[PDB]
Each structure stands twice: as structure tokens, then as C-alpha cells.
Amino acid sequence: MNYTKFDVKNWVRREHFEFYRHRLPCGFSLTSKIDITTLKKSLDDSAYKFYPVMIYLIAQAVNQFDELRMAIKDDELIVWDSVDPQFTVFHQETETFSALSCPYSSDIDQFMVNYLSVMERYKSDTKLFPQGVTPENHLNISALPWVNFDSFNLNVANFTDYFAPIITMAKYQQEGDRLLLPLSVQVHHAVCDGFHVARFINRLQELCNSKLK
Amino acid sequence: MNYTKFDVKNWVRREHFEFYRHRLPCGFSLTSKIDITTLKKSLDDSAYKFYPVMIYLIAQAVNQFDELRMAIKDDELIVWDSVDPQFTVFHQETETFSALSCPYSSDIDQFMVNYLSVMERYKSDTKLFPQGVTPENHLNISALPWVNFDSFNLNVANFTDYFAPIITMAKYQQEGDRLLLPLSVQVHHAVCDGFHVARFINRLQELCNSKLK
Amino acid sequence: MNYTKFDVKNWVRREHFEFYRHRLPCGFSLTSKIDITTLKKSLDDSAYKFYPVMIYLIAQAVNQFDELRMAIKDDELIVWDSVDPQFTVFHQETETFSALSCPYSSDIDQFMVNYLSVMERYKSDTKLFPQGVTPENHLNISALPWVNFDSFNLNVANFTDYFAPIITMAKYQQEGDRLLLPLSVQVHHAVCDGFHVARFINRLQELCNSKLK
Ligand SMILES: O=C(N[C@H](CO)[C@H](O)c1ccc([N+](=O)[O-])cc1)C(Cl)Cl
Ligand SMILES: O=C(N[C@H](CO)[C@H](O)c1ccc([N+](=O)[O-])cc1)C(Cl)Cl
Ligand SMILES: O=C(N[C@H](CO)[C@H](O)c1ccc([N+](=O)[O-])cc1)C(Cl)Cl
Ligand SMILES: [Co+2]
Ligand SMILES: [Co+2]
Ligand SMILES: [Co+2]
Numbered sequence: 001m002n003y004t005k006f007d008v009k010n011w012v013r014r015e016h017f018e019f020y021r022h023r024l025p026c027g028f029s030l031t032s033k034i035d036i037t038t039l040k041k042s043l044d045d046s047a048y049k050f051y052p053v054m055i056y057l058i059a060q061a062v063n064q065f066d067e068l069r070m071a072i073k074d075d076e077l078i079v080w081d082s083v084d085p086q087f088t089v090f091h092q093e094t095e096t097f098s099a100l101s102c103p104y105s106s107d108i109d110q111f112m113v114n115y116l117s118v119m120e121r122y123k124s125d126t127k128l129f130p131q132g133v134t135p136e137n138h139l140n141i142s143a144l145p146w147v148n149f150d151s152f153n154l155n156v157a158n159f160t161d162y163f164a165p166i167i168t169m170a171k172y173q174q175e176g177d178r179l180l181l182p183l184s185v186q187v188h189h190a191v192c193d194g195f196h197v198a199r200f201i202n203r204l205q206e207l208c209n210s211k212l213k
Numbered sequence: 214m215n216y217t218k219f220d221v222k223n224w225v226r227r228e229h230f231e232f233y234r235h236r237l238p239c240g241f242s243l244t245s246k247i248d249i250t251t252l253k254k255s256l257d258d259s260a261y262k263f264y265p266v267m268i269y270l271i272a273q274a275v276n277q278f279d280e281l282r283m284a285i286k287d288d289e290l291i292v293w294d295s296v297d298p299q300f301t302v303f304h305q306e307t308e309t310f311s312a313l314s315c316p317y318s319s320d321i322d323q324f325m326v327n328y329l330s331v332m333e334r335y336k337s338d339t340k341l342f343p344q345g346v347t348p349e350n351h352l353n354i355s356a357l358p359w360v361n362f363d364s365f366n367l368n369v370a371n372f373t374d375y376f377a378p379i380i381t382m383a384k385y386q387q388e389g390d391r392l393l394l395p396l397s398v399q400v401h402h403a404v405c406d407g408f409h410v411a412r413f414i415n416r417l418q419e420l421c422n423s424k425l426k
Numbered sequence: 427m428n429y430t431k432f433d434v435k436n437w438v439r440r441e442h443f444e445f446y447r448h449r450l451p452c453g454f455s456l457t458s459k460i461d462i463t464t465l466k467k468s469l470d471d472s473a474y475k476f477y478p479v480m481i482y483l484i485a486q487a488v489n490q491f492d493e494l495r496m497a498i499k500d501d502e503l504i505v506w507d508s509v510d511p512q513f514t515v516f517h518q519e520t521e522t523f524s525a526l527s528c529p530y531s532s533d534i535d536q537f538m539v540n541y542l543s544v545m546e547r548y549k550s551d552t553k554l555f556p557q558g559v560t561p562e563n564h565l566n567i568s569a570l571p572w573v574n575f576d577s578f579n580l581n582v583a584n585f586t587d588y589f590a591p592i593i594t595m596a597k598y599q600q601e602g603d604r605l606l607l608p609l610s611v612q613v614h615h616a617v618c619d620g621f622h623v624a625r626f627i628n629r630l631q632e633l634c635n636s637k638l639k
């Protein structure tokens with residue numbers, strides 16, 4: 001299959017996993033600003049567009065760390081070999097959104113092909129989930145391009161055993177010499193500590209500062 | 214009556230409404246900074262005070278968009294023709310607050326009269342709700358004038374079917390050439406998407422940048 | 427004992443206490459930036475390290491206000507005469523954390539001795555709670571030194587009657603001429619209003635701006 005059952009008995013976080021899963025169930029969100037000054041220049045020198053690139057970069061970073069690809073399957077903790085981004089798409093005509101997903105590829109060009117293809121096929125589809133059920137191996141990404149925010153948090157009535165990270169981006173803004181993008185990350189404490197989230201954000205910042213290809 | 218039953222069957226968000234109301238109940242909060250540089254100048258050229266003006270402006274913006282004035286009445290989704298602000302008042306003497314409400318008016322001067330009148334009558338009343346039950350057609354506004362914040366979120370143990378927006382303002386501060394006011398907006402996802410919140414904030418920013426009368 | 431039963435019947439917030447405890451149970455979080463420019467200079471002129479000093483200062487501020495030291499004991503509302511900080515410690519080797527506590531002292535030097543001693547004894551212990559049960563009279567402090575954030579919020583599935591404040595600090599950063607530290611405070615609304623949180627933050631800022639000894 002496309003996942004491995006994780007070895008919980010020998011895991012250094014096994015106590016923390018049971019503690020935050022069942023004793024004191026909780027998750028947290030944090031919003032930090034990523035410097036996209038370099039990324040903006042790379043985009044300017046290319047034909048790629050901002051949203052799909054960010055989707056690719058966030059998916060790439062998630063795909064590097066096991067703790068961001070955990071799930072419960074058949075009552076056991078698993079790690080997905082890879083996850084595909086599920087992202088929101090806004091319909092200007094109805095002023096409503098849909099969620100779509102497309103397969104992740106470490107090849108940026110192949111990822112763009114996948115994206116444009118899904119976009120082409122469902123750009124007019126106003127169902128919340130035009131493709132039907134969300135792939136189990138997913139990450140959620142959403143964008144609020146119309147307003148800048150310093151914080152964002154989702155208040156969910158029940159998040160039992162839901163371990164996929166939730167990432168939300170706001171409109172970027174110029175802050176002196178830098179172009180900053182607010183990015184909110186929301187995780188379940190059973191699989192992620194503050195260290196793991198910081199590590200993800202640091203890695204994303206490095207990717208934004210690196211060549212696209 | 215002062216409300217209309219909304220046409221849920223023909224609404225473009227009908228799927229989203231059922232989804233976020235019952236399948237995955239959730240709400241979100243976001244804090245953004247409004248530029249009040251212009252507003253400060255308009256206030257300086259007038260006799261109006263900051264808090265009541267902000268209350269008026271937030272109420273005016275809410276009163277423009279239907280999705281911010283929804284409620285469930287007799288198990289059906291309704292839109293209030295208009296909502297009145299319910300705002301917090303601090304008592305320096307007991308270091309406690311009360312919540313008061315006064316009727317909204319599109320006439321700023323008539324609104325100020327309503328405000329001062331409610332303030333006059335209950336300035337000494339330390340009950341949490343001096344006027345008794347909160348009007349059903351309300352919006353909540355609160356102020357924390359003593360500290361600046363970049364984020365604010367309310368963790369509510371049960372928010373089933375509570376659709377009135379919650380707005381919280383912090384102490385404003387000078388940020389280079391601008392005077393910025395942190396404003397947190399917290400809504401239920403069944404009636405509001407990120408688009409709707411951004412639209413509200415953008416409209417509020419425009420009102421702050423416009424003549425008072 | 428080390429606590430006093432609080433006089434709820436004569437308290438000015440008695441209505442608010444019942445309201446936010448049982449009618450509309452909720453808490454809130456806020457993140458604000460503390461200016462640590464002066465503190466950094468005091469630290470530079472000393473042998474004290476940043477983390478333990480912040481722990482001391484946060485504990486000192488908490489120890490000054492009764493509303494931050496409330497709890498329910500034997501179904502009654504009590505105030506602890508004093509609380510000890512419970513703080514997180516990261517283990518670089520396992521990339522996991524533990525929580526430790528040490529007795530508060532108004533004497534900074536005696537506090538440092540207590541801290542170093544607990545640190546010495548459990549630096550290698552990877553249990554989540556190396557010392558065993560958390561003292562009932564505690565405050566929680568956590569640090570995310572690896573990333574700066576503008577917001578942080580804990581989404582807790584059940585926080586009934588849990589009144590100890592939760593404080594989270596991020597990596598500090600230079601903001602023009604100032605060194606700013608993001609600090610998130612999360613409280614239960616039954617015992618703390620926005621005023622009380624602002625008062626705590628203002629007092630902490632004053633302590634950071636004052637001599638250590
Ligand atoms: O609901 C979704 N997205 C919204 C868009 O505002 C938001 O990002 C979200 C994501 C996950 C979530 N959850 O898993 O509880 C709730 C809301 C996707 Cl699952 Cl379609
Ligand atoms: O409780 C209230 N206000 C507080 C003040 O801190 C806060 O703004 C708030 C508003 C709404 C809320 N809710 O509806 O769950 C909870 C807290 C008003 Cl309802 Cl009186
Ligand atoms: O769980 C704890 N700390 C974490 C570390 O991320 C976090 O600060 C936290 C604190 C309190 C909490 N609560 O009381 O619900 C939940 C998480 C301490 Cl209780 Cl050990
Ligand atoms: Co268990
Ligand atoms: Co891989
Ligand atoms: Co239903």
C-alpha cells in the first residue's frame with residue numbers, strides 16, 4: 001500500500017501521543033510571516049503563478065516530514081508515503097468556493113500540469129467537492145487573497161484523530177524591504193509539537209528562498 | 214416582522230451551509246489591522262469620541278451584508294432587516310464590565326444620541342446585562358483599550374447555530390506613518406466564508422477612510 | 427493551607443463567574459509583543475540566561491494578581507497563596523519535550539538555584555512529567571524558540587474549570603530599534619476578563635523594563 005504502520009511502541013513520543021490523543025486532546029494554531037521577497041523574484045523570472053507555486057512548496061515541505069503525514073487507519077497509526085494537496089478555489093461568479101485536489105509530484109513542471117488539468121476540468125463546478133470524496137492522504141491548504149491577517153484560527157467542534165495539517169495563507173504585503181506572507185498552520189498535538197511546526201515553517205522559508213528548478 | 218426567512222433551497226451556498234452547520238461544525242477568527250490614520254483626523258475635527266464611532270462604523274458595515282445578520286428562528290434560517298450593536302462597557306470603580314445595546318441608525322447623529330442616552334442611564338449599573346435580555350438582532354463588539362494585540366480568539370465550549378459575528382478591538386498603535394487598530398472578527402463557517410469576512414473588513418476600512426457625515 | 431477559599435458571594439464579578447463558568451463556558455487567547463530591549467541589556471550585564479529569567483518574570487507577575495491563581499478545590503473557588511511555574515524543556519537528542527516545575531521565590535538568585543537544580547537532575551529524563559504529578563498550584567509556560575509567530579492558540583477539547591493561565595513565548599526578533607518577544611496568554615473567561623489579561627501583560631512589560639535585582 002501507499003502507507004506504513006508506524007512503530008508506536010518504540011517511538012520516542014509514544015507517551016505524548018497517548019497524552020494528547022486521549023488524556024488532554026488538543027491541537028494548536030500559529031501564524032507566522034514567511035519572507036517571499038526571493039520567491040517573488042523567481043516567479044517574475046518564470047511563467048509560474050503564485051498560488052500553484054505556494055501549493056507545490058507547502059506540499060513539498062509536508063512530504064519531507066513524517067509527523068505531518070500521520071493518520072489513524074483501522075485503529076492503527078500510519079504514515080502516508082506521500083500526500084496530495086487539497087486546496088480551495090474561489091468562483092467569482094457565485095462568490096463561493098470549492099475544494100480540489102491533484103497529485104503531488106516532486107517535479108514542479110509535472111505538478112503544474114496536474115494542477116492546470118484539474119483546474120481546466122472543474123473551473124465551472126460549484127459543488128463543494130467536485131471530484132467526490134477527498135483522498136485519504138491529503139493536506140488542506142486555503143487562501144484568503146483579499147485581506148491581510150496577522151492571525152487565523154479554526155474553532156472546530158470535533159477534531160478527534162484528525163491529524164492532517166491545515167494551512168491558511170493571507171494576502172501578502174510589503175513590510176519595509178520585504179514582501180511578507182502570513183501563513184497559519186493548525187495541527188493536532190498528538191502528532192506535532194511546537195518543534196515540528198517550527199521545523200516545517202523553517203523548511204518552507206528555505207524552499208521559498210531556493211531555485212524553483 | 215423585522216426579518217425575512219431566507220431561501221435556502223435556491224442559495225448558492227446551500228451545500229456549504231449544511232456542511233459547516235452539521236457535518237463539520239466550525240467557525241474561525243482572524244485579526245487584521247485597520248488603518249485609522251484618516252479616521253483619527255476626522256475625529257480630531259469633530260466632537261465624536263473614538264469608541265462610539267467605531268461601534269457605529271462596525272454596525273454600519275454589518276448592516277450592509279446579509280450573511281452577517283443570519284440566525285435560526287423557529288428552526289429556519291432568517292436574515293434580520295437590521296441588527297443593533299451590543300458592546301462592552303468597563304466600570305473603573307469595580308474593574309468589571311457590562312454589555313449594553315442601543316438601536317442602530319444610519320444617521321450618525323441620531324446613533325450618538327441613542328448611545329449617550331443608554332450610557333447616561335446605566336453608567337452606574339454593574340449587572341452583566343443591565344437592560345435585561347439581549348435583543349435577538351444583535352452583533353457583539355468588545356474593546357480591550359489597555360493593550361495592543363496581534364491576535365485574539367474566543368475558545369467557546371458550544372457555539373451551535375450562533376451566527377452573529379463577534380468583533381474585538383485592541384489599543385491602536387503608531388506603526389511608522391500609520392495609526393493601526395487591531396480588529397479580530399470571529400464567525401461561524403455555516404454562514405461566512407473567508408471571502409465574506411475579507412469583504413466586511415475591506416468595507417470597514419473604506420468607511421474609516423470616508424467622511425463621517 | 428497554601429490557599430484561601432474565595433468569597434464568591436460578595437465578589438463584584440460573581441455574576442460573570444457563574445455566566446462564563448456554566449452558562450456560556452469560554453476562554454480566550456491573545457498574543458501581544460513585549461519590548462525586551464531593556465531586558466536584553468540587563469541580561470548582557472549579568473550571568474542570567476533568557477529562558478529562566480522569563481520564567482521568573484512571568485511567575486512574578488502571576489504571583490501578584492489573585493485572578494491568575496484561582497482554582498476549584500473540593501467544589502469551591504480558591505486562590506493559591508503562590509504558584510510555581512511548570513515549563514517545557516526540549517531534549518535535542520530525541521527532539522521531544524518534558525515539563526518540569528520548580529518552586530517560585532521572590533529572590534531571583536534563589537529561583538535560579540532552584541531552576542538549575544531541577545535542570546541538573548532531569549536534563550536526561552525523557553518522560554513527559556519526570557517529577558510525577560504536577561503541583562496543583564502551577565502556571566504553564568512554554569517556549570517555541572525556533573520560530574517567530576504573531577499568534578498562537580490552543581484548541582482544547584475540554585477545559586472545564588481549568589483556571590491556570592497558559593503562556594507561550596516565540597523566538598524574539600528585531601523590529602526597527604526594538605527587540606520584540608511575541609507572548610500568547612490563554613485564560614478561562616470565568617476568572618479573567620480582558621482587563622485582567624492586559625493588566626498582567628502591562629505589569630510584565632514593566633518588570634522587563636526594571637532592574638533584575
Ligand atoms: O473545509 C475545508 N476548508 C476550510 C475552508 O475555509 C477550512 O480551511 C477548513 C479546513 C479543515 C477543517 N477541519 O478539518 O476541521 C475545517 C475548516 C476543506 Cl475540508 Cl473543504
Ligand atoms: O460575553 C460577551 N462578551 C465577551 C466579552 O469578553 C466576548 O466578547 C464574547 C462574546 C461572545 C461570546 N459567544 O457568543 O460565545 C463569547 C464571548 C457578550 Cl455576550 Cl456579554
Ligand atoms: O501540555 C502541556 N503543555 C503544552 C506544550 O505545547 C501546551 O502549552 C499546553 C498547556 C496546557 C494545555 N491545557 O491545559 O489544556 C494544553 C496544552 C503541559 Cl500541561 Cl505539559
Ligand atoms: Co488511550
Ligand atoms: Co518521501
Ligand atoms: Co443536517
Ligand SMILES: [Co+2]
Pocket residue numbers: 276277294
Ligand atoms: Co438595509
Ligand SMILES: [Co+2]
Pocket residue numbers: 444448449
Ligand atoms: Co451554575
Ligand SMILES: [Co+2]
Pocket residue numbers: 489490507
Ligand atoms: Co503574595
